Amino acid sequence: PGTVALREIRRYQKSTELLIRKLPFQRLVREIAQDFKTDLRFQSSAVMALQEASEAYLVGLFEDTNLCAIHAKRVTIMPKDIQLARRIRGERA
Amino acid sequence: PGTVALREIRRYQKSTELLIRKLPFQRLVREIAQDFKTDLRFQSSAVMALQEASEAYLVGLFEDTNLCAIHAKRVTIMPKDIQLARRIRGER
Amino acid sequence: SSRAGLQFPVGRVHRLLRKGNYAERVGAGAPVYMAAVLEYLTAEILELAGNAARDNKKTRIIPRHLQLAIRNDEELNKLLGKVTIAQGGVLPN
Amino acid sequence: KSRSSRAGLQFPVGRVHRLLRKGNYAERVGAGAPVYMAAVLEYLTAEILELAGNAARDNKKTRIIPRHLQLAIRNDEELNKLLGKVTIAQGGVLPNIQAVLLP
Amino acid sequence: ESYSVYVYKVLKQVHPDTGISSKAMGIMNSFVNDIFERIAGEASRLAHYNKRSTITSREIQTAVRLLLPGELAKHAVSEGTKAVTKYTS
Amino acid sequence: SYSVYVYKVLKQVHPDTGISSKAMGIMNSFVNDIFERIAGEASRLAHYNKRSTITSREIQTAVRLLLPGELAKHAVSEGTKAVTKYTS
Amino acid sequence: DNIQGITKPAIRRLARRGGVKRISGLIYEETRGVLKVFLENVIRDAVTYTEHAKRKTVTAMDVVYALKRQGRTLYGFG
Amino acid sequence: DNIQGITKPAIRRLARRGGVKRISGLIYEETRGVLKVFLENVIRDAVTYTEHAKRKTVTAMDVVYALKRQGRTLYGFG
DNA sequence: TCAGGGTGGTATGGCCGTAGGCGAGCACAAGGCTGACTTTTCCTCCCCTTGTGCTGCCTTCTGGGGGGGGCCCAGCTCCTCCCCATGCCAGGGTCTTTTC
DNA sequence: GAAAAGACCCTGGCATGGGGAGGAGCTGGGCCCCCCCCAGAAGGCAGCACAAGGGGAGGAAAAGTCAGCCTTGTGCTCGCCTACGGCCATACCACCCTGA
């Protein structure tokens, strides 16, 4: 139960596509922006710029969470690894 | 062995002095700047600014190192911890 | 400053704006706004740094009080998150 | 006369001049600032593009795509440090796994 | 740029007993000379974003709420619109 | 938009390899970013010494502050070569 | 409600891109909260820029500016 | 060779200020080489400004700007 | 030593007309993706032991901190002026948009 | 990516205020030395508690399977928003003197 994970890593590191479905992500963008301004409109490139950055922030956060996991002599990443990574990069202490 | 370390923690956390000796710090600074430009003078305030920046940087690093030890179920901070903190920070 | 009720110098901030090359034209409300915002922020950071001084049984403000007040907050700490306050020490934690 | 040939350059020293002046960076702008900041960017572009073209030829391809620019930037140590806050769109990540993770 | 004369006035209105040491005055000079460049570096590029040439209370308002956290920007903007209103009037 | 000059540089270094329309919308952002970087640093360098002009000394110091290591060394060399060729 | 459109396969795919081999079952909600905070922080700045330019539509550059305002300059969107 | 002037007691006091309880035996040598690169960066970004201003005395303002350009602002020295 | 009252002007900006691109909304398949389930293997987590490196303490000896003083190169100021960068206009060369 | 037409400012020429490079004067503060002496560092030893290895158990990810659903690629429409244009209104800059 660790070989499919190793080929999944080798598959999703070689590719550059967007791993979050565009329609639900655009719905999330539109549902968040509403609390700031009602009747707001977006371009296609506004959504595709929010997503293309939200999918690099999360990948970087995961490459730091994995480092915390390896530090703790572990392979299963846990929420406390994310918390440590965020605290140390200063995102939210 | 460790209660004297907790009282030490309290003492050096309640205090704002410079924990590195000023003359050795100055000689280190003037040794470092010699590589860049020889016969380079320094102010007193310039060296004090460097020592205030460095002693806050190192103190801030030793707080991330302690987190990287509490993560690994340890109390002894180690170079492994310093490198983990300095890599997650972005410096390494 | 007298017309706008500002203890910060509206004329001086106007001179700083014009000489600072921010734009080629500074309006007549720009330095009035940006001498009430700085004045308010200074008042905000002095309130807490004086309350800390009252907490250390001292009639004087010191960088220790300033760092203590700035860090023991939520929004001032977020704003001044990459600032080194000389002779400030660190919060007892 | 072409001041971007008087220097030996290919970036427009004239357009860099007008951008330096319009951007409000100083009340005056010298006569060598546009030529210096049209050879810094030309050299930096000629470096990143050469590295990305090499990365594309390593993938048996003949057209640079954002993946190759990201590969070149994140593979070179200097460009890593220069572009350390840059999110290259449609770039992916560097193919790399931990050694504590393999069987 | 010394604001030492003015930082001392505003303290006399809030704390009429507490003083500032010369080391803590040299810090508040660095503070005000820092949020001054912070605000009018955001209110500067905002004009260039709009291809505009004038920095006014519309751009200062935007820069303030673009750099100040949460309830701070809700108050920093509040004081300014209470200032420019009196200045023009 | 620097697309034509990025094309010229690309054709000069790698004359067989081409560039995509989205690998070109990154070079434009790259050049626009590393312009607004050196130009802001040279602006600070002029303002601190209380100058009104920006020249190829404030550009050179900004290069030396921004670019790391051999990048800065070679960029300074190229800038000096271009300015000393324009002047001549 | 739309935060669950970031499905468990999507977060796991992102983690596999980040090199994560094994994923605990609580990582998914943590990543959803994290993404929500990131999006809330960037969109606020983008809409503030849009309101300043008096527009009604959030342009791509209005987001690029909100992203370079956070030290996360984004290349590729003009 | 004045890097040994950052003595083990000083590195331990700096550690106690951060909250460290127990210190390994390689922490001192590993902190010396961290402070060395930090100073090597700042005392290069300050001498750059010094040389530009055609001065030979490094000023607190050169240091403060060299620190500001690395994301670490310092309040107190001008 | 610098900000404020008064004059003139002109350029930057405010307001209405407009038309067209793009952004939102609606069906419609229908296959790829997702969600639920099951088995089971591997990973996490706890417990035990030890032996080793870390701490605490004691003594000695050093070298950094606190002054005092000399001097001597360096940074700041003042005045000259000259050489560099700017405001403005003519014309076309180059950069911008479309088509294959 | 190359060919073809257009339109927008690039480059040259002319007149000009001004910005900074230079020489001189000055003074100040940074380096260098001298003395003391006492607190701090360095070394050594006892002892102790903590990190790391070993082992075992169980439970929670992971892999394979199957059924449902819903994103999306497509087509179509409506309209509103926004960039451009035209006209003109007044806000602030350059300048002249003064008083805080």
Numbering used by the authors:
A (entry chain E): 43 to 135
B (entry chain A): 43 to 134
C (entry chain G): 18 to 110
D (entry chain C): 15 to 117
E (entry chain H): 35 to 123
F (entry chain D): 36 to 123
G (entry chain F), H (entry chain B): 24 to 101
Sentences from the paper on this structure:
pmcThe specific interaction of proteins with the nucleosome is central to the regulation of chromatin function and dynamics. The tardigrade damage suppressor (Dsup) and vertebrate high-mobility group N (HMGN) proteins bind specifically to nucleosomes via a conserved motif whose structure has not been experimentally determined. Here we used cryo-EM to show that both proteins bind to the nucleosome acidic patch via analogous arginine anchors with one molecule bound to each face of the nucleosome. In addition, to study nucleosome structure in the context of active chromatin, we analyzed nucleosomes that were reconstituted with a promoter-containing DNA sequence from a Xenopus borealis somatic 5S rDNA gene.
Unexpectedly, cross-linking of the 147 and 167 bp nucleosomes with either glutaraldehyde or formaldehyde resulted only in cryo-EM structures of unwrapped nucleosomes, which is in contrast to non-cross-linked samples that show both closed and open conformations. Furthermore, the cross-linked nucleosomes exhibit DNA that is flexible starting at SHLs ±5, indicating greater flexibility in the upstream DNA end in cross-linked nucleosomes. In addition, the two H2A R77 residues in the glutaraldehyde cross-linked 167 bp nucleosome adopt different conformations that are consistent with the highly flexible DNA ends. These findings support a relationship between the conformation of H2A R77 and the flexibility of the nearby nucleosomal outer gyre. Importantly, glutaraldehyde causes only a minor increase in the histone Cα root-mean-square deviation (RMSD) values, suggesting that octamer interactions not involving lysines, such as those of histones H2A and H2B with the HMGN motif, are largely unaffected by the cross-linking.
